[PDB]
């Protein structure tokens, strides 16, 4: 997250931190995710497409720090890793960038809700907030484009949803952004998601209820003028999500 604020997991209790184990025992952070039901985390396919081996991955819930334990945290294996079959990537744009991770502890248990671990609501079909709505993003991604390490503490920020008409402008993304994506950015281009924040949640307060409106997917640079963050439009993938859960 470029700019924004350091946060704690109680503020974002659906947030899932996803890591990959490497040959030789080193573990590295891969991507963010959102708990949509006790056994299911939703994320982005681009995060896993080059290493589609579910045994490699570790998922935490209840976790505020990148490389230290948090009280109440819970550690999971991936029982099922489901990537969208029509995923593709262009020069910038990523298509059908959505993934589901069925999680289980070593005891075979799914998530247990607590103060630091809760599910996020899915949106209803074709029900997104109006452009200009403020939504939040969360992640362990880079704070600056010059960083070569991720922050130790979880971050969040607030961005505004941008219309398809604006996002399709020539100096924005042209026809590279589609109606299955949402753009969101800061009017001053001072805050944004960045590399490492992929897969994580774009949460909007939608008719009273905190809703998973987007999944961090792509963008040209980070917090770059006229280059919003682009998000998987969750409300379009409900049938996909329902059949695979």
């Amino acid at each position: 997250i470029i700019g924004g604020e350091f946060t704690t997991i109680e503020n974002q209790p659906w947030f899932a931190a996803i890591y990959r184990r490497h040959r030789g025992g080193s573990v590295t952070y891969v991507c963010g995710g959102s708990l949509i039901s006790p056994c299911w985390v939703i994320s982005a396919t681009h995060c896993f497409i080059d290493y589609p081996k579910k045994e490699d991955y570790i998922v935490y819930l209840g976790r505020s720090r990148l490389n230290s334990n948090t009280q109440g945290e819970m550690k999971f294996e991936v029982e099922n890793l489901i990537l969208h079959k029509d995923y593709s990537a262009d020069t910038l744009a990523h298509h059908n960038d959505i993934a589901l991770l069925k999680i289980r502890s070593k005891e075979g248990r799914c998530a247990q809700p607590s103060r630091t671990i809760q599910t996020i609501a899915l949106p209803s079909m074709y029900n997104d907030p109006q452009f200009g709505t403020s939504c939040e993003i969360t992640g362990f991604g880079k704070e600056q484009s010059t960083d070569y390490l991720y922050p130790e503490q979880l971050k969040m920020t607030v961005v505004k949803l941008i219309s398809h008409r604006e996002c399709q402008q020539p100096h924005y993304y042209g026809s590279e952004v589609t109606t299955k994506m949402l753009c969101a950015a800061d009017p001053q281009w001072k805050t944004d998601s960045c590399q490492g924040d992929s897969g994580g949640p774009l949460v909007c307060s939608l008719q009273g209820r905190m809703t998973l409106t987007g999944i961090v997917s792509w963008g040209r640079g980070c917090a770059l003028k006229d280059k919003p963050g682009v998000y998987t439009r969750v409300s379009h993938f409900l049938p996909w999500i329902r059949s695979h859960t």
Binding site: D50, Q195, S198, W218, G221, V230
Partner: peptide, 14 residues
């Protein structure tokens, strides 16, 4: 990997 932006996490970049 690529370190070019969102979309590049956990990639094999030969």
């Amino acid at each position: 990997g690529x370190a070019l932006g969102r979309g590049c996490e956990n990639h094999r970049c030969l």
